[PDB]
Amino acid sequence: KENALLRYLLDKD
Amino acid sequence: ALLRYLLDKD
Amino acid sequence: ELTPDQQTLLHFIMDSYNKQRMPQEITNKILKEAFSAEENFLILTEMATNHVQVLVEFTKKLPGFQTLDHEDQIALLKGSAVEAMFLRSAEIFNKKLPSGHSDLLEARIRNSGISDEYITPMFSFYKSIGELKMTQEEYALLTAIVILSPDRQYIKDREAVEKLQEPLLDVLQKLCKIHQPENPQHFACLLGRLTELRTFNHHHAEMLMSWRVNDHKFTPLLCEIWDVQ
Amino acid sequence: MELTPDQQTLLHFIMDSYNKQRMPQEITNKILKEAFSAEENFLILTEMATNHVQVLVEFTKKLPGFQTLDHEDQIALLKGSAVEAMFLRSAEIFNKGHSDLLEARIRNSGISDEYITPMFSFYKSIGELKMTQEEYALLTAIVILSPDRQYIKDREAVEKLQEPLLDVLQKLCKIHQPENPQHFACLLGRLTELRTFNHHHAEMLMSWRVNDHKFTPLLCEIWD
Numbered sequence: 001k002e003n004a005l006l007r008y009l010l011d012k013d
Numbered sequence: 014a015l016l017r018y019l020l021d022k023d
Numbered sequence: 024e025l026t027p028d029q030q031t032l033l034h035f036i037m038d039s040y041n042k043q044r045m046p047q048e049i050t051n052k053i054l055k056e057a058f059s060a061e062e063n064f065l066i067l068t069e070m071a072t073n074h075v076q077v078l079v080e081f082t083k084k085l086p087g088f089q090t091l092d093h094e095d096q097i098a099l100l101k102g103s104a105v106e107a108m109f110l111r112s113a114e115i116f117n118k119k120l121p122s123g124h125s126d127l128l129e130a131r132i133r134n135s136g137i138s139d140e141y142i143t144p145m146f147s148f149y150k151s152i153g154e155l156k157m158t159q160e161e162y163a164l165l166t167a168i169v170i171l172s173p174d175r176q177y178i179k180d181r182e183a184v185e186k187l188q189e190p191l192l193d194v195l196q197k198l199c200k201i202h203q204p205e206n207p208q209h210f211a212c213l214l215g216r217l218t219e220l221r222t223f224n225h226h227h228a229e230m231l232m233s234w235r236v237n238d239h240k241f242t243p244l245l246c247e248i249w250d251v252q
Numbered sequence: 253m254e255l256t257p258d259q260q261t262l263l264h265f266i267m268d269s270y271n272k273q274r275m276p277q278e279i280t281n282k283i284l285k286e287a288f289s290a291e292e293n294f295l296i297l298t299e300m301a302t303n304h305v306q307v308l309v310e311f312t313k314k315l316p317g318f319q320t321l322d323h324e325d326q327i328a329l330l331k332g333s334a335v336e337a338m339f340l341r342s343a344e345i346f347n348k349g350h351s352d353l354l355e356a357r358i359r360n361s362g363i364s365d366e367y368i369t370p371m372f373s374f375y376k377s378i379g380e381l382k383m384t385q386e387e388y389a390l391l392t393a394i395v396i397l398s399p400d401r402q403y404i405k406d407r408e409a410v411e412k413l414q415e416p417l418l419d420v421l422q423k424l425c426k427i428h429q430p431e432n433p434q435h436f437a438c439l440l441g442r443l444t445e446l447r448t449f450n451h452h453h454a455e456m457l458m459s460w461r462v463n464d465h466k467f468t469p470l471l472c473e474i475w476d
């Protein structure tokens with residue numbers, strides 16, 4: 001599903 | 014081989 | 024022969040590439056911590072995790088990338104995460120044999136529960152790209168080219184990605200023709216080692232369905248990005 | 253079917269004299285220390301080699317009855333054995349600890365990767381047998397005292413020297429693994445396998461070299 005760890009990882013500033 | 018001039022001793 | 028807007032691309036990427044080294048923390052472990060599979064497996068995973076962060080920070084910095092569909096970036100990094108790792112592993116093995124670490128790195132991979140059948144090719148491969156004797160500059164782009172590989176699985180818009188790739192491919196195009204004029208096959212033999220790398224994807228992912236130590240488990244980021252089990 | 257006291261005493265002779273012979277920690281420190289240069293690797297190894305040979309000779313000289321051998325046959329035995337003798341200490345060391353760097357030093361010491369890989373694959377295989385430090389002692393003593401070396405004037409005399417050491421082994425394979433019977437020949441065949449790897453060892457020494465150094469005095473006594 002939504003692999004969020006990576007979403008966050010790049011979404012972070 | 015040739016003369017393996019090697020003392021065992023010690 | 025490298026337009027000035029290319030020398031701007033190149034300069035940046037080397038800033039992009041080196042800015043993120045990895046902790047001296049998890050490095051005094053390589054050259055000191057003791058030697059069991061229990062121990063070694065933990066070091067490597069922890070590094071692997073560490074380097075996905077280095078790999079995303081870089082990816083983040085790459086030209087344009089940021090604009091691409093948010094739900095694509097994820098698709099591009101869930102792809103290269105592995106393959107780019109193999110490019111790193113080369114930079115530190117066939118290149119760069121210092122006196123500090125690196126061989127004590129190979130040491131721990133030898134006793135990591137990783138299966139010899141899986142290893143002795145992967146290393147005989149590190150020999151192969153060794154024989155090219157590549158540039159830090161040469162690895163630098165490669166890695167970027169791979170982050171930006173137009174048709175990873177499940178991409179929204181390829182052209183958008185191709186777009187971003189081309190300026191990098193055409194530098195390294197010239198860079199090869201310039202810094203190595205002797206045989207022009209080279210550039211294609213570089214691109215070929217990329218293809219030679221997407222074949223290492225399957226072999227890797229199969230190995231995961233077997234790597235196991237004293238009831239240890241993989242870091243959660245790792246599992247996510249190597250789609251483990 | 254346990255062992256006798258006589259056999260039990262040779263065994264504890266062999267160990268005590270096998271294990272007594274240590275290698276000098278000055279180097280044992282060096283392996284877990286010195287720089288990782290192609291060159292420094294090779295120096296660190298020829299040390300290990302030469303230092304080992306000395307230990308060998310010491311070990312042979314303790315072996316019961318060796319005393320009693322035509323000196324031209326003492327020589328002949330130690331040159332024949334020594335290589336193979338080292339292959340066993342090697343196989344002992346590389347599947348025991350917290351010093352894997354010996355493997356590491358070798359995988360950057362000027363030896364070809366085509367030579368290196370089989371040797372370890374063989375070393376791993378002999379790991380599988382999983383062998384009591386006892387068994388390595390006896391198997392070494394047997395390789396040493398091996399009558400069929402070239403230039404070995406009076407055999408027989410050697411046969412009769414090696415016979416106790418075998419005999420003791422044949423019991424252990426009963427009195428420790430009566431599961432598979434054809435074990436004794438399991439070992440005695442792995443033995444025979446090692447007597448090949450030294451012709452391959454040979455053809456390496458010719459190739460081998462790093463920043464053109466040179467071999468220690470004793471170790472040159474094999475070949476040129």
Ligand SMILES: CC[C@H]1[C@@H](O)[C@@H]2[C@H](CC[C@]3(C)[C@@H]([C@H](C)CCNC(=O)NS(=O)(=O)c4ccccc4)CC[C@@H]23)[C@@]2(C)CC[C@@H](O)[C@H](F)[C@@H]12
Pocket residue numbers: 044045046050053067068070071074108109111112115124125128132137142145146227
């Ligand atoms: C070939 C087997 C071996 C090898 O690929 C391993 C890999 C895990 C990730 C590693 C460990 C890579 C690290 C994370 C590289 C990035 N870190 C880093 O660079 N720190 S560093 O810059 O401070 C440094 C520099 C120089 C020396 C020491 C440390 C290089 C070798 C890479 C595997 C174990 C499992 C997966 C399987 O696919 C692969 F086959 C395996």
Ligand SMILES: CC[C@H]1[C@@H](O)[C@@H]2[C@H](CC[C@]3(C)[C@@H]([C@H](C)CCNC(=O)NS(=O)(=O)c4ccccc4)CC[C@@H]23)[C@@]2(C)CC[C@@H](O)[C@H](F)[C@@H]12
Pocket residue numbers: 274275276280297300301302304338339341342345351354358368371372453
């Ligand atoms: C396969 C490649 C590799 C390996 O066999 C090497 C061998 C040199 C002699 C070594 C170095 C042997 C030493 C002399 C054994 C005696 N030392 C010793 O016992 N130290 S120790 O007891 O302080 C100790 C204890 C525990 C861990 C570490 C050290 C073991 C590995 C042996 C070769 C480089 C060249 C020729 C080729 O045939 C052999 F194939 C090569």
